[PDB]
Amino acid sequence: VDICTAKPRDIPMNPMCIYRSPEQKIPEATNRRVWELSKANSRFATTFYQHLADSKNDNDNIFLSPLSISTAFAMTKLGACNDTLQQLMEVFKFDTISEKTSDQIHFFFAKLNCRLYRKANKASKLVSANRLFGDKSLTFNETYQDISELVYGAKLQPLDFKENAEQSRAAINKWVSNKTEGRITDVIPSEAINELTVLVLVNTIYFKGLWKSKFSPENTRKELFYKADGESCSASMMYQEGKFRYRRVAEGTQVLELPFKGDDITMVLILPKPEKSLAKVEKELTPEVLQEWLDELEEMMLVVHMPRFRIEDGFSLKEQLQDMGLVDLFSPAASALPGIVAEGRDDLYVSDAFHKAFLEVNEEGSEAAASTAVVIAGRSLNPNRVTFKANRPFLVFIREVPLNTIIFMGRVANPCV
Amino acid sequence: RKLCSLDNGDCDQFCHEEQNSVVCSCARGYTLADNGKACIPTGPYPCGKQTLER
Amino acid sequence: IVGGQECKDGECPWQALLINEENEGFCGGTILSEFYILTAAHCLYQAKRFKVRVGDRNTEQEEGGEAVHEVEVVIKHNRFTKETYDFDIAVLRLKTPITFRMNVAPACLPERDWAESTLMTQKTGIVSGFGRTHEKGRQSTRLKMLEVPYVDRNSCKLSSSFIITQNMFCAGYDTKQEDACQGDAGGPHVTRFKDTYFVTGIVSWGEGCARKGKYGIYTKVTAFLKWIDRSMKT
Ligand SMILES: CO[C@H]1O[C@H](COS(=O)(=O)O)[C@@H](O[C@@H]2O[C@@H](C(=O)O)[C@@H](O[C@H]3O[C@H](COS(=O)(=O)O)[C@@H](O[C@@H]4O[C@H](C(=O)O)[C@@H](O[C@H]5O[C@H](COS(=O)(=O)O)[C@@H](O)[C@H](O)[C@H]5NS(=O)(=O)O)[C@H](O)[C@H]4O)[C@H](OS(=O)(=O)O)[C@H]3NS(=O)(=O)O)[C@H](O)[C@H]2OS(=O)(=O)O)[C@H](O)[C@H]1NS(=O)(=O)O
Numbered sequence: 001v002d003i004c005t006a007k008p009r010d011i012p013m014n015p016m017c018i019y020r021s022p023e024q025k026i027p028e029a030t031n032r033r034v035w036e037l038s039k040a041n042s043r044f045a046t047t048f049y050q051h052l053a054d055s056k057n058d059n060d061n062i063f064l065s066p067l068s069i070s071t072a073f074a075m076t077k078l079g080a081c082n083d084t085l086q087q088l089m090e091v092f093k094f095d096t097i098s099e100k101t102s103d104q105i106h107f108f109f110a111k112l113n114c115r116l117y118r119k120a121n122k123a124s125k126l127v128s129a130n131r132l133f134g135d136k137s138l139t140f141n142e143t144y145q146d147i148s149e150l151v152y153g154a155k156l157q158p159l160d161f162k163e164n165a166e167q168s169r170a171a172i173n174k175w176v177s178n179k180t181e182g183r184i185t186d187v188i189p190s191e192a193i194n195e196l197t198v199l200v201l202v203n204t205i206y207f208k209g210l211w212k213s214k215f216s217p218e219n220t221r222k223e224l225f226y227k228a229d230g231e232s233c234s235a236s237m238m239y240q241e242g243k244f245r246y247r248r249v250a251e252g253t254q255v256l257e258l259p260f261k262g263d264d265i266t267m268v269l270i271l272p273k274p275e276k277s278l279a280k281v282e283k284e285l286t287p288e289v290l291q292e293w294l295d296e297l298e299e300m301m302l303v304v305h306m307p308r309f310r311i312e313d314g315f316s317l318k319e320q321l322q323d324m325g326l327v328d329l330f331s332p333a334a335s336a337l338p339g340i341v342a343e344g345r346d347d348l349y350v351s352d353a354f355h356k357a358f359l360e361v362n363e364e365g366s367e368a369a370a371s372t373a374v375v376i377a378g379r380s381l382n383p384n385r386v387t388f389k390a391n392r393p394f395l396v397f398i399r400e401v402p403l404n405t406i407i408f409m410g411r412v413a414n415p416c417v
Numbered sequence: 418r419k420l421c422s423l424d425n426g427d428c429d430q431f432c433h434e435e436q437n438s439v440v441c442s443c444a445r446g447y448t449l450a451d452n453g454k455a456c457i458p459t460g461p462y463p464c465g466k467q468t469l470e471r
Numbered sequence: 472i473v474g475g476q477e478c479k480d481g482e483c484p485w486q487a488l489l490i491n492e493e494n495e496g497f498c499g500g501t502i503l504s505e506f507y508i509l510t511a512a513h514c515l516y517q518a519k520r521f522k523v524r525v526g527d528r529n530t531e532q533e534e535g536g537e538a539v540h541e542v543e544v545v546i547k548h549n550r551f552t553k554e555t556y557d558f559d560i561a562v563l564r565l566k567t568p569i570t571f572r573m574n575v576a577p578a579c580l581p582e583r584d585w586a587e588s589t590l591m592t593q594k595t596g597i598v599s600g601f602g603r604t605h606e607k608g609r610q611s612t613r614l615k616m617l618e619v620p621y622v623d624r625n626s627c628k629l630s631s632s633f634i635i636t637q638n639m640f641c642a643g644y645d646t647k648q649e650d651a652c653q654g655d656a657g658g659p660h661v662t663r664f665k666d667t668y669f670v671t672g673i674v675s676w677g678e679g680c681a682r683k684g685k686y687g688i689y690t691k692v693t694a695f696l697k698w699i700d701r702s703m704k705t
């Protein structure tokens with residue numbers, strides 16, 4: 001059975017413990033709920049990025065899929081109860097959504113991903129590898145396992161953590177590999193899983209878009225990059241002029257949208273003013289202001305200086321999330337996951353969540369329409385040229401056009417090397 | 418081939434022929450010399466002159 | 472420009488540069504004198520708010536010596552068309568006169584007849600600007616200049632896909648691949664006689680930039696010295 005064309009309540013629905021909390025028009029072909037479960041992620045994405053930002057060095061590149069990190073903990077929200085769930089509800093902002101959704105949610109999140117899966121791969125490539133992991137001994141629910149299969153993709157994979165732990169760890173990794181066909185690997189580090197690691201969250205993504213309008217390699221050359229630590233750098237700097245959508249907000253930060261093939265997936269970049277420190281932008285980042293950056297965009301003839309870069313991120317989500325209010329989900333002494341087991345003695349929790357994202361960005365892209373123009377080629381330039389030479393600290397965003405989902409979030413700090 | 422045809426009438430700039438005979442003139446900012454076949458500037462930075470101060 | 476080189480201090484003082492409110496060049500000029508600038512017509516067509524910067528040889532780094540003047544009066548040749556690129560020229564009167572200095576001085580304007588017989592017959596001239604450097608490459612940071620053999624009118628025509636007005640003229644190397652390119656329009660094309668340079672044509676159009684058997688098209692100044700100084704009297 002395929003979820004991308006199979007409404008809920010067409011499969012065992014309405015699970016155990018369902019949480020309850022004490023004019024904007026819907027786009028073209030779209031389900032009111034998806035667009036909902038979607039905007040929720042958006043709400044969640046900014047907060048999270050922020051925290052995860054302090055966890056690292058202003059000089060380390062950043063990358064990730066809020067939507068993944070989001071959808072995963074949705075497979076937990078699925079089988080959670082009491083004071084534990086509430087949290088998972090208010091930290092992933094799933095408390096805004098309506099009744100139904102806030103229940104079958106785990107399903108929609110799927111129905112969402114699919115949509116975002118096609119358009120993406122249709123012209124470009126998006127690989128994902130994510131599963132939930134638990135020890136043998138524990139006898140996991142039969143149902144959840146059924147749900148988890150036809151919703152998150154696969155069931156839960158029991159491993160011998162207690163037995164030969166590491167033997168199991170490095171067994172997960174390999175799995176990621178045989179799925180992301182190489183690209184992502186070592187999702188989980190060393191000294192992450194020991195003889196207590198009962199349950200771990202694992203979501204990982206790879207993405208390499210395709211420019212709607214390529215970049216000539218022949219116009220790529222080593223130039224300088226002015227790091228935030230003050231330092232200098234030499235990276236591969238690409239370059240091309242064309243009409244793109246763009247906006248210089250009042251503040252002055254610069255918003256550039258570069259579409260991938262088909263204009264279904266664009267990757268806007270946020271390049272602040274040199275006066276401004278990419279951090280302040282990050283310190284002051286809100287969902288409300290993510291809006292301003294896009295809400296008003298104009299198509300202009302702007303020259304784009306963008307670097308060629310790669311970014312592979314691996315990190316424990318637990319550290320962060322915790323600080324954000326999710327506590328119980330990770331404390332054995334006080335959990336509430338009677339949905340995936342309900343038998344032990346309050347013996348089920350999450351030891352860690354491993355998110356591994358990887359982004360590629362070379363000149364590549366294409367449509368190659370044709371030499372569709374054979375007229376007098378005036379030798380003057382566009383009087384209204386505007387330039388975007390992102391040869392310094394800039395944010396990254398990868399979204400869906402109609403739905404406006406923030407697929408990928410990220411930051412380019414150190415390109416060169 | 419005759420007047421201005423031959424070595425541009427030994428002038429320094431423009432060549433003509435008022436009264437079946439060679440005549441010279443100069444671009445604005447210049448002043449023909451008393452010898453009549455050479456253009457002597459009128460100021461410091463005159464047209465066509467690559468700025469060279471050293 | 473495509474090929475050529477880089478005007479060393481004071482080799483192309485007349486080069487001017489039109490720039491926008493966001494500050495960006497996009498059309499060469501030709502200092503005709505302390506007030507009037509000589510540029511292309513198509514340059515201002517879809518333009519909007521600009522200014523002329525003089526004697527600046529580097530855009531990535533401003534270091535004085537460079538001056539920014541404002542435009543008091545724009546005058547496009549009333550008979551210009553983006554459909555024939557004929558009459559692609561225009562004169563610019565600034566609001567506050569230029570102050571000549573190194574890297575900054577005019578270029579002389581020939582006298583019709585003499586011109587057509589002494590500069591136009593000459594073998595080469597020098598176009599310059601901050602254009603690209605391949606049909607669709609990068610903009611130049613610095614001010615390149617390049618020499619260009621005049622081309623046989625009757626030949627120009629056989630190579631041209633588009634007609635060639637007697638207002639135009641060709642300049643390119645039969646096989647060498649160097650030329651003027653986008654960002655260069657409106658720039659100077661000066662021809663030397665003795666120790667003086669005269670402006671001869673304006674950087675207009677062309678098919679691509681340095682294509683096989685394709686030539687550089689320049690507005691024949693020598694055929695406007697009239698409409699010019701006429702304009703030079705508003
Ligand atoms: C307490 O009240 C709350 O719960 C009750 C009961 O919930 S329960 O079912 O869990 O018990 C809710 O009532 C129930 O929900 C109804 C509902 O969702 O409207 C209804 O759901 C069924 O019927 C829906 C309407 O169908 S339709 O024929 O009128 O279209 C259907 O919703 C439609 O889904 C499709 C879809 O998902 O494909 C939507 O298509 C739209 O998007 C598609 C692309 O999606 S994508 O993901 O973005 O890619 C496009 O291809 C398509 O073009 C586009 N339509 S378009 O016009 O824009 O082009 C379509 O818009 C939706 O209307 C339900 O599918 S579902 O996926 O949305 O769930 C379907 N589910 S089903 O039950 O399995 O069949 C239930 O019948 C109804 O039960 S009830 O007993 O009758 O009440 C109640 O709404 C809820 N109140 S609330 O929570 O506060 O809001």
Ligand SMILES: *[C@@H]1O[C@H](CO)[C@@H](O)[C@H](O)[C@H]1NC(C)=O
Nearest residue numbers: 017081082083336337338342
């Ligand atoms: C969990 O759920 C209910 C609240 O609905 C609570 O009364 C109960 O004590 C909690 N703990 C359990 C599972 O006994």
Ligand SMILES: *[C@@H]1O[C@H](CO)[C@@H](O)[C@H](O)[C@H]1NC(C)=O
Nearest residue numbers: 174175177178179180181182
């Ligand atoms: C992935 O694993 C399967 C089953 O173990 C194996 O058949 C396949 O060869 C692996 N991937 C490849 C193509 O190497």
Ligand SMILES: [Ca+2]
Nearest residue numbers: 529530532533
């Ligand atoms: Ca400069």
